[PDB]
Symmetry: C2
Subunit: 210 residues, 2 copies
């Protein structure tokens, strides 16, 4: 009756810029809703919060910030959401989340040359997701995307480095590589095949990075 168990499932999309994360998670969520499964759609960065408004401005080059300043904002933005998320998952509501601490590490080490550990430390103790679908597109695949170049990191050479740093996570048992250069529909079914593989049962919360 004093229950502290995670009851929803936590699903994260990771990927390079414009890689289809909104496209996929919308659909996943939509699929989850036609199957008696409850789910909230989240995303990082959340540009609505105080902290979030500053991240946005950085991304849009309306301001500039130092590497370590912006990195810690991205991380704080995830912690300002931990209760929300924890609450949802306690209640049995699934969370499908577009970007997370991986983005944080991939981007900052890749694009801003920060040290990976340094980059990881702030995000330690955030809730561990049950799965990450890394939508995988090659950096030069991305550029053909509709709004490519409008935001700070969307330059081929930069994505090129971010693509390489993302492999820092390939060895995780929840890291699921998805070849994302396809028909939206194909990618979608893979995700589905993979989400029903998971068994629905209550369990203790886990935290990064362990």
């Amino acid at each position: 009756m004093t229950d502290d168990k995670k009851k929803g499932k936590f699903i994260v999309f990771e990927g390079l810029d414009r890689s289809g994360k909104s496209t996929q998670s919308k659909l996943l969520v939509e699929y989850l809703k036609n199957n008696n499964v409850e789910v909230k759609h989240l995303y990082f960065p959340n540009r609505e919060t105080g902290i979030g408004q500053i991240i946005s401005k950085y991304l849009k080059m309306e301001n500039s910030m130092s590497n370590e300043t912006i990195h810690l904002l991205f991380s704080a933005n995830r912690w300002e959401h931990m209760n929300e998320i924890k609450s949802l998952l306690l209640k049995g509501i699934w969370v499908v989340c577009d970007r997370y601490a991986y983005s944080g590490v991939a981007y900052s080490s890749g694009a801003l040359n920060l040290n990976k550990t340094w980059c990881m430390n702030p995000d330690q103790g955030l809730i561990k997701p049950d799965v990450v679908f890394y939508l995988n597109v090659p950096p030069n695949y991305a550029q053909n995307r509709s709004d490519y170049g409008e935001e700070i990191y969307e330059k081929v050479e930069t994505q090129k480095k971010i693509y390489e740093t993302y492999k820092h996570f390939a060895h995780e048992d929840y890291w699921i590589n998805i070849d994302a250069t396809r028909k939206i529909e194909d990618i979608h079914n893979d995700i589905v095949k993979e989400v029903t593989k998971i068994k629905v049962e209550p369990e203790e919360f886990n935290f990064l990075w362990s």
Copy 2:
């Protein structure tokens, strides 16, 4: 000509709430200007910035935030200043600083119950000061001073836990314990005495947490 040495000295004050840090540093700056040193007065948190504004609001109880959200903001706030303080110290301007990283560790783990290491990590890599002046007073000492209680940690029980965690720095190279229970001018005196002790010569930059 391609020179990256530190030519200014960098002095932090640490202490519990309302200990006399602003007071003691207005004095040290005054003194430094007389005896011909160029010096800039800084303070943390710097409430005036996009981030500081959020910290301010937090401290006044105009918002709440998770512990981790706020702690990374305190850190971010110092990183957004490093470019400035590095330029100053590069040129030979001294920096006198009201509060720094130590505040972040002592407060966060003491008042908020965060893991020490985790608290330090985000500050790892900031410029190291030369000397820290800790204005030691007993935890219940300061409670009569003009505005005490207006801001979040200004509770006797909370001060005690902070006092215990500041000890984690107590007997270190750069750490200088000052009995700040005294009349202002006697405190000032003991500071100047240790300040005259400094060697003025250029040197390598040092970083937290070495």
